[PDB]
Design a protein around this ligand. Structure first.
Ligand SMILES: O=c1[nH]c2cc(C(F)(F)F)c(N3CCOCC3)cc2n(CP(=O)(O)O)c1=O
Ligand SMILES: O=c1[nH]c2cc(C(F)(F)F)c(N3CCOCC3)cc2n(CP(=O)(O)O)c1=O
Lengths: 174, 130, 60, 169, 173, 61, 32, 124, 49, 169
């Protein structure tokens, strides 16, 4: 939900702030060691914690580094919440009005037959819009054979549909 | 009760302050007993899940706040059923929907002609009051 | 006989699976994996540093 | 004592060499209109073999200032100059160490050069918007070794300060 | 999210609670100290010592519930921003063109459309004709498709005026 | 016409969605229950451990 | 509103601290 | 949300990390104690002493990031359930009626619909 | 027919809902900037003190 | 000495009286098809004036268990019986204090009775699924007085235990 590259910059800023803490804490102790500085930097990177410094400089380095990661992990929480909100969004296509409501997933029929003549001689304006899309498509959505439509659907990864009879669709489903 | 029954939480304010710290996230004085620690473990994951639910419901209501905009088309009128709508009871406005050939306006005239109660008004001010 | 029994597919298991009851365990399994990996790594580091400290203190 | 000084010297030399290699070539990579490598000075396609300066900053004012910083890599060049100055200060403080405070200023400049290098790496990662070149990882490793060398340098400085404080009493 | 000016109000309340906590903690004749009380208020603000005077701890607890409500609302509103992402248009009405000057707008170099603005008597359209007649550089385009290419290469900086039917037809292509 | 258009049921539950309805106590009452159960468990455990400590203090001291 | 409840709690705790300090200082000055 | 059985895995990992942290803390020849290590792992699980053995601190940090990701994902999925709230039907097909017995089902007392079930040849 | 149906724009709620760009560095780089600025400020203040 | 004991006794008596008033009537308010009050046994409308027992338990197994608990007020009646038993124990411990350890068991029973009354208030609030009655606020205030009386009772008990420990040496 964030990236695969922001994390490396966050860890680099983490070890940089630990270098800052071991620099200034040994230049002005409880943070006399490199592990004490790194462990306080790890405690400042997460929420909870341990050992509170008393210096002005260590406190202001913590205040810079700490509201920083507060906002970042709050953003992580909000971003994962947004992704799971997307995860429970709109169900897949279950009606022809769902096909008329979208334009991202194209669809086609057979190039010749009474199936195309149904949409050609239709009077319902939804199916008229369907025949308008099928008659003015770029490129042609019509296939020569039924197995051509099968190969067109199976090589689409959810981007193309096909319209046919129910018995043939259920047989190819089985 | 239990801290003064076996310290650090000997006072009423120390017990109330550790209760406040266990109700919130951060904090102060760590107990050492089995009983006080298990009271904190019962009381504390409790309010953890509760304020998590508070955060989740507030985010849900702010998601609700940025939902569907108000009506801007007749297709928006056809897509809903809560907000009713009507025209004047006499005039070319009702004759427009009655003689319409578009199925959207035909569904509009079908809903207004079969409305319970009647959505039609007598005057303009009657529609203003409605 | 000729659509269900003759066919090469199993039961048309409901509507494409079951019901996204909740979130899958795969993220949880991956963080379990990195937790067990870090646990074993820190355990072996603790063992070797205690071995080093014991060899330092016992042999002066 | 001296082994830590030699390790700090070869770490500073390796960090300067990896910074030079990061400035040089193969910093980032992107598929053009075929793949193409880039080293923050000019891009080279995978006809094939041609190279041209594709670091063109044109096609609020904060976007203009960010494009001006990302143009010609202002931050990492000055960071590498500060790294070379810190390395020259460490080389001047290694032999004939008369001043007992030049190593602290050298380490402070070295840590600030590392922080500016990390900031320039963040700017260079932000200005790119699919893979990345090996010189980015080399610059990251040079930043890590530079941080460790700064830790070792200030550790040697506080050990020298503690030895001077023990000899003063 | 959640604020454009209220962050300064949070900082002012932070300074005020710090001053009150220092006035309580350092007036009894450990937890005293102006920077110590300031950094303890900072520790009360985000997540990661405690007063024992049992009166400034009330200030710390109400500040601590206060900032917990703030960070909960911040997480909620940031999730609300990252959820919907419904971008809106900056220009809505015809007076929006006269209300600003950063986003330019132009008409065709010849035709009755420019004659409408030249012969107008409304002060809004008079200001529009004054702005377009003294435009630097020339906002007038040669053809209709030239205006389409000028708008499509503007990235939200230049608009074009024309008849509504042709505008909606270009919108539906 | 005589089933979908004549009928009184709009087949669109996508517009005008679920408005802000606050969190029920049904999701909170089972949490209250395990709270009270943990409180009673901690009370009984503290009482039996103090009884054991009092018996050990009376017998050995 | 949360600003208002913060100001209310701040003023209430401030006046409580003031009166308890006044009472404690008066008792310590009168007794000792 | 998010789990029906994974909470037991969380509790088992809690006990395991507690045993590992005590085994590090009670093998150095303040932070010792099996209930002390267990209560510090509990304090690591939710938000609210620190070990200084520099090897079990790695265990504490990885457990602490672990449960931080857990509570973040729990907050996210609980917001996801409180956001959409699109409930589904328990019964989908005709075999679902034969698959359960708690929800009963019936037809009219007389008619050819009941004669279809009376003269059927399918075992379902 | 000749504008809405003949046109190549769907335009009826064409603003699709997924858009799963996880997170860009645009919201992160400005926070990196104030991070590095606070680090340099703390460095110079500690050095002058 | 006796002032705190008398204050604890009158606090327990007032808590028992407010618990009896919460058992009696006017516990909740619910607008029927007009407003109507209820006291967990029968409902009374605001025709007007008639009263009847509207605590009908029918119209997973956890819903049946919650309906069985909400029926006939299993929690608050046993809570009031435990409060009366704690008051009788405090009255038996007020005069002729022979054993100095029954006050701890009486206070533990009193705190458990308060916790059970709070749990029963949570059950009655959960089973409500528009205003509230005054006896609910009276029961809440009696819970507050019971908590304060339990704190005062255990404070007097630890003071008596400290006095006995100081007199034992
Ligand atoms: O009389 C007709 N009977 C048809 C019977 C079938 C089948 F289902 F196989 F029995 C099919 N197919 C449906 C899809 O898989 C390929 C063949 C097409 C038929 N067509 C052509 P239409 O004009 O397009 O309907 C007819 O004319
Ligand atoms: O010729 C007609 N000219 C009309 C002019 C007007 C207006 F100018 F707006 F006043 C109106 N109104 C609009 C609705 O509120 C009441 C007045 C009605 C008119 N009608 C009746 P129609 O049959 O409903 O069109 C005519 O017949």
């Amino acid at each position: 939900p964030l990236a695969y590259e922001i994390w490396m910059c966050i860890v680099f800023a983490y070890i940089g702030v630990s270098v800052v803490l071991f620099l200034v804490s040994r230049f002005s102790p409880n943070e006399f060691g490199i592990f004490n500085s790194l462990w306080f930097s790890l405690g400042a990177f997460m929420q909870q914690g341990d050992i509170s410094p008393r210096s002005l400089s260590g406190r202001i380095v913590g205040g810079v580094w700490w509201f920083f990661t507060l906002i970042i992990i709050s953003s992580y929480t909000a971003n994962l919440a947004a992704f799971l909100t997307v995860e429970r969004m709109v169900s897949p296509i279950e009606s022809a009005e769902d096909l008329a409501k979208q334009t991202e997933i194209a669809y086609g029929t057979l190039d010749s037959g009474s199936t195309k003549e149904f949409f050609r001689r239709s009077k319902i304006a939804v199916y008229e819009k369907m025949w308008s899309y099928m008659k003015s498509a770029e490129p042609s959505v019509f296939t020569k054979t039924t197995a051509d439509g099968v190969a067109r659907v199976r090589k689409s990864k959810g981007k193309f549909a096909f319209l046919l009879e129910s018995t043939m669709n259920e047989y190819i489903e089985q | 009760l239990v801290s003064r029954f076996s310290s650090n939480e000997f006072g009423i304010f120390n017990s109330l302050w550790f209760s406040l710290g266990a109700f919130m996230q951060q904090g102060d004085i760590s107990p050492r007993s089995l009983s006080g620690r298990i009271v904190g473990g019962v009381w504390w994951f409790f309010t953890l899940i509760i304020i998590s639910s508070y955060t989740a419901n507030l985010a849900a209501f702010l998601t609700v706040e940025r939902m569907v905009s108000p009506i801007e088309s007749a297709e928006d009128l056809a897509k809903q059923t809560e907000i009713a709508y009507g025209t004047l009871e006499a005039g070319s406005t009702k004759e427009f929907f009655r003689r319409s050939k578009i199925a959207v306006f035909e569904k509009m005239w079908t809903y207004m002609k079969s409305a319970e109660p009647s959505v039609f008004v007598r005057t303009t001010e009657e529609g203003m009051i409605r | 006989k000729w659509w269900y029994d003759k066919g090469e597919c199993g039961a048309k298991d409901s509507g494409s699976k079951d019901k996204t009851s909740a979130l899958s365990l795969s993220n949880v399994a991956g963080v379990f994996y990195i937790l067990v990996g870090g646990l074993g790594l820190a355990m072996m580091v603790a063992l070797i540093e205690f071995c080093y400290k014991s060899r330092a203190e016992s042999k002066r | 004592r001296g082994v830590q000084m030699l390790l700090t010297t070869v770490g500073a030399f390796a960090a300067f060499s990896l910074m030079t290699i990061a400035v040089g070539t193969d910093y980032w990579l992107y598929s053009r209109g075929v793949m193409t490598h880039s080293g923050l000075w000019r891009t080279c396609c995978l006809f094939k073999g041609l190279c041209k300066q594709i670091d063109h900053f044109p096609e609020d004012t904060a976007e203009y200032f960010l494009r001006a910083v990302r143009a010609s890599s202002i931050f990492p060049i000055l960071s590498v100059i500060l790294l070379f100055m810190g390395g020259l200060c460490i080389a001047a403080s290694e032999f004939y160490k008369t001043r007992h405070n030049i190593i602290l200023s050298a380490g402070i400049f070295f840590v600030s050069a590392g922080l500016s290098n990390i900031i320039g790496i963040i700017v260079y990662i932000s200005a790119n918007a699919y893979s990345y070149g090996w010189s980015f990882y080399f610059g990251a490793l040079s930043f890590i070794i530079a941080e460790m060398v700064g830790v070792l340098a200030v550790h040697m400085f506080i050990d020298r300060h503690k030895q001077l404080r023990a000899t003063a009493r | 999210p959640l604020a454009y000016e209220i962050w300064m109000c949070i900082v002012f309340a932070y300074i005020g609670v710090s001053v009150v906590l220092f006035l309580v903690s350092r007036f009894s004749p450990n937890e005293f100290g102006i920077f110590n009380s300031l950094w303890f208020s900072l520790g009360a603000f985000m997540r990661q010592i405690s007063p024992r005077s049992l009166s400034g701890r009330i200030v710390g607890g109400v500040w601590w519930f206060f900032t917990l409500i703030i960070i909960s609302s911040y997480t909620a509103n940031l999730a609300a921003f990252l959820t919907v992402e419904r971008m809106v248009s900056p220009i809505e009405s015809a007076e929006d063109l006269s209300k600003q000057t950063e986003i330019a707008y132009g008409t065709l170099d010849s035709g009755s459309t420019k004659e409408f603005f030249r012969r107008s008597k409304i002060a809004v359209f008079d200001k529009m004709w004054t702005y377009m007649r003294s435009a630097e550089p020339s906002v007038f385009v040669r053809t209709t498709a030239e205006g389409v290419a000028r708008v499509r290469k503007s990235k939200g900086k230049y608009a074009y005026l024309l008849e509504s039917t042709m505008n909606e037809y270009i919108e539906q292509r | 016409k005589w089933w979908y258009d004549k009928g009184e049921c709009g087949a669109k539950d996508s517009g005008s969605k679920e408005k802000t309805s606050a969190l029920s106590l049904s999701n909170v009452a089972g949490v209250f229950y395990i709270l009270v159960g943990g409180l009673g468990l901690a009370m009984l455990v503290a009482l039996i451990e103090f009884c054991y400590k009092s018996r050990a203090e009376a017998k050995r001291m | 509103g949360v600003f208002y409840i913060l100001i209310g709690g701040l003023g209430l705790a401030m006046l409580v601290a003031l009166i308890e300090f006044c009472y404690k200082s008066r008792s310590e000055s009168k007794r000792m």
